[PDB]
Amino acid sequence: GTILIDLSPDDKEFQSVEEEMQSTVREHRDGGHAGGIFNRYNILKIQKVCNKKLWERYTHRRKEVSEENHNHANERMLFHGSPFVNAIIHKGFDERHAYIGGMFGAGIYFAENSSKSNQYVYGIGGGTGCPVHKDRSCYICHRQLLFCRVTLGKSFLQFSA
Amino acid sequence: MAHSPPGHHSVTGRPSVNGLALAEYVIYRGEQAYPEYLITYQIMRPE
Ligand SMILES: O=c1[nH]c(-c2ccc(-c3ccccn3)cc2)nc2ccccc12
Ligand SMILES: [Zn+2]
């Protein structure tokens, strides 16, 4: 039930998503080991992901959270990188998309920095890099990230190195 | 998947060392995220 609709680069919606991608790149403490060495991206395509059943699954849970938190979903737009992007857009997020070994326990992780999520496109630690060239800093192979609507509700604050 | 801390719906990882890093977040229910945009891109080699 998932359809992908291309956004035109002339569309304000394309432009605001591209700006969030580009403007949230940062340098990483690994010097580029996991995600590659770069300051910006070449955006090739931005598609809207349309799935009625998955959207209703999201809004159902969003209302449950909001009602538990004085009518405040605390909804954010955040990046997600994963080897399982295809599974996610067709079947939805679930426990098989969790980072079992993450710093905050086994859950599904999202980043404000697009470059943080870029470190996970080829797996934890960048895995072995792109499938064609085995290069975590490949400048040739096309990568994909998701820009996701996320309900945080009441969020537990961890101060962390 | 783990559970959210009791009385909470997510965890926020606030950076406490790298002053330039932004926050990271964890949810423990897949129903709390919807993949609105699929972005296809390359990283660019710095000049
Ligand atoms: O976008 C992110 N993806 C991931 C990530 C990590 C692991 C996996 C994964 C999922 C299933 C099996 C193996 N690995 C999927 C996504 N971790 C992050 C951690 C911090 C901030 C952002 C992310
Ligand atoms: Zn490659």
What Rg, from alpha-carbon coordinates, does chain B have?
Answer: 16
Which amino acid is it at A130? C
Q: Are A61 and A151 in contact (CB under 8 A)?
A: yes
- A63: alpha, beta or left? (left if phi > 0; alpha if psi -120 to 50): alpha
The residues, any chain, with a CB within 8 Å of residue A67's CB and separated by 6 or more, are: none
Residue A97 near chain B (CB below 8 Å): yes
Beta carbons of A36 and B20 less than 8 Å apart: no
Quote the CA–CA distance of B1 and A108 in Å, as a whole number.
8
How many angstroms does the Cα of residue A30 sit away from the middle of ligand 2?
A: 20
- C-alpha gyration radius of chain A: 16
Residue in B39, B12, B44 with CA at minimum distance from that of residue A21:
B39
- Closest of A28, A7, A45, A9 to residue A118, by C-alpha: A28
Place of tokens 């404000």: A112
Q: Kindly list the protein residues that place their beta carbon closer than 5 angstroms to ligand 2, a single-atom ion.
A: A 130, 132-133, 138, 140-141
Ligand nearest to the Cα of B43, by number: 2
The shortest C-alpha distance from B21 to chain A (Å) reads 7
What was the structure determination method? Answer: X-ray
Query: What distance in Å separates the CA atoms of residue A154 and residue B37, rounded to the nearest whole number?
Result: 25
Q: Which residue ranges make up each domain of chain B? A: 1-47
Q: Give CA–CA dist B26/A146, Å, rounded.
A: 15
Phi, psi of A40, deg, nearest 5: -160, 170
User: How many CB atoms sit inside 10 A of residue A7's CB?
Assistant: 18
Copy the structure tokens of residue A82: 């994963």
Main-chain phi, psi angles of A96, to 5 degrees: -75, -5
Backbone torsion region of residue A70, taken as left when φ is above 0, otherwise alpha when ψ lies between -120 and 50, otherwise beta? left
Distance A125 CA to ligand 1 centre (A): 9
Residue B2 one-letter amino acid: A
DSSP A82-106: -TTHHHHHHH---GGGSBTT-TT-S
User: Would you give the end-to-end CA distance of chain A in angstroms?
Assistant: 41
**Phi, psi torsion values for B31, nearest 5 degrees:** -65, -15
Amino acid, single-letter form, for residue A125? G
Q: Residue A53 belongs to what H/E stretch?
A: helix A52-67
What resolution does the deposited structure have, in angstroms? 1.5
User: Does the B1-47 domain belong in CATH 3.50.50.60?
Assistant: no
Backbone dihedral region for residue A132 (phi beyond 0: left; psi -120 to 50: alpha; all else: beta)? alpha
Segments making up each domain of chain A, as ranges: 1-161
Question: Which chain B residue's Cα is nearest to A63?
Answer: B32
The class level of CATH for A1-161 reads: alpha beta
CA distance A112 to B21: 9
Query: Is residue A130 within 8 Å of residue A122, measured between CB atoms?
Result: yes
Nearest CB to B37; choose among A95, A113, A147 = A147
Q: Who lines ligand 1 at CB under 6 A?
A: A 79-82, 97, 99, 102, 109-111, 116-117, 120, 124; B 24
What number of C-beta contacts closer than 8 Å exist between A and B?
A: 230
The DSSP bridge pattern shows strands B24-27 and B33-43 to be unpaired
